[PDB]
Each structure stands twice: as C-alpha cells, then as structure tokens.
Design a binder for these strands. Structure first.
Ligand code: ZN
Ligand code: ZN
Ligand code: ZN
Ligand code: ZN
Ligand code: ZN
Lengths: 76, 74
DNA sequence: ACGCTATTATCGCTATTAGT
DNA sequence: ACTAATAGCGATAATAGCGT
C-alpha cells in the first residue's frame, strides 16, 4: 500500500512510539531524553525520501572513491 | 522483558550521578576532568538517525578534502 | 561509593485513518 | 469491506541518582 501521508511527529518519537509535542527545531521529547541533535521531521513522502537516500548514498560512495584516487596520486 | 538502554553517559552511570546529558560530552564529567571519555550508549530507535548523521558529516568532510587535494595537486 | 525504590521509558495492544 | 499504516496509551520492567 502507498504512503501518501507525511507524519507530523518527529522520526524518533515515531520509532519510540510516544506522543510528540512536535515543537521545532526539535521537540521537547527528544530534548528531554538528550537526543535533540537527532530530532527531525519528514518533509516528503516515504517514497521520495527513499529515493533521496539512495541518491545520497551513491553520491557519498563515489566521493570516497574519488578521494582515495586523489590521495593515492599525492604520493604515488 | 524489555530492552531498556541507559540514556546518560557511561561514567555518570558508573558513578550513579545525574547526567546533564549534554553532547558530545556532559558537564558532569567535564567538571571531573574526563570530558573526552564521555560517550552514550546506542539506542536502537536512534540507529537510523545516527547512521544518517554520520553520512552527512562524512559527505561534508569529503567535499572539503576533495577540494583541498585538488589544490595540493597544483 | 552505592544500596534501593521513586522516577521513567518500552512495546504489546487498542483506535483510527485511509489504500484498493 | 478488508486490513496495511499510523498514533501513541500505559502497566510495569528497569534504570535513575538521592541520600546514608
Ligand atoms: Zn518528537
Ligand atoms: Zn524529536
Ligand atoms: Zn554524564
Ligand atoms: Zn571529545
Ligand atoms: Zn559524561
């Protein structure tokens, strides 16, 4: 089944299965438990979000390859 | 039987005091001279957010190094 | 330093919204 | 309808961190 809804609570509160006061930047829930730096809200749908991560992973992966290449050239 | 993982830093637990929980290192064990030995345990409901935080920080540093190397190569 | 129980977070389970 | 996603309550397992 398709997921068109964009959750209003933060990702962590969702995972922890507890009510999110949904304050921004970070919710009190996360600030309280000390994970405010991990608190964030979804802006796109599950699917758009999945794609985005795939792109970022590939970008990340290729950059590591490139850097290795350059470092290897700076001492060949 | 649940899987409750402690939230404060390893030391404060060990000592049994209240952890201000500040990140990356709490004031509790910054006052006692061990700041950079202060770390927290990984919560399962934080793996993903955590993994995503490394990825971002790393994509960030790699872009700074690629430029730094591209120059040092001339 | 730590024993010890008041404080506090987990996740089975109830409701409810919404894809087909 | 049927029931996959969501929201998240709350009994209570367990950590939290106070006070000896
Ligand atoms: Zn939240
Ligand atoms: Zn949050
Ligand atoms: Zn601490
Ligand atoms: Zn440090
Ligand atoms: Zn600490």
């Amino acid at each position: 089944r398709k997921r068109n809804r964009i959750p209003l609570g933060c990702t962590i509160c969702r995972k922890r299965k507890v009510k999110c006061d949904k304050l921004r930047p970070h919710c009190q829930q996360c600030t309280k438990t000390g994970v405010a730096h991990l608190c964030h809200y979804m802006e796109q749908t599950w699917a758009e979000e999945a794609e985005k991560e795939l792109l970022k992973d590939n970008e990340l992966k290729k950059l590591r390859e490139r850097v290795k290449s350059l470092e290897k050239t700076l001492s060949k």
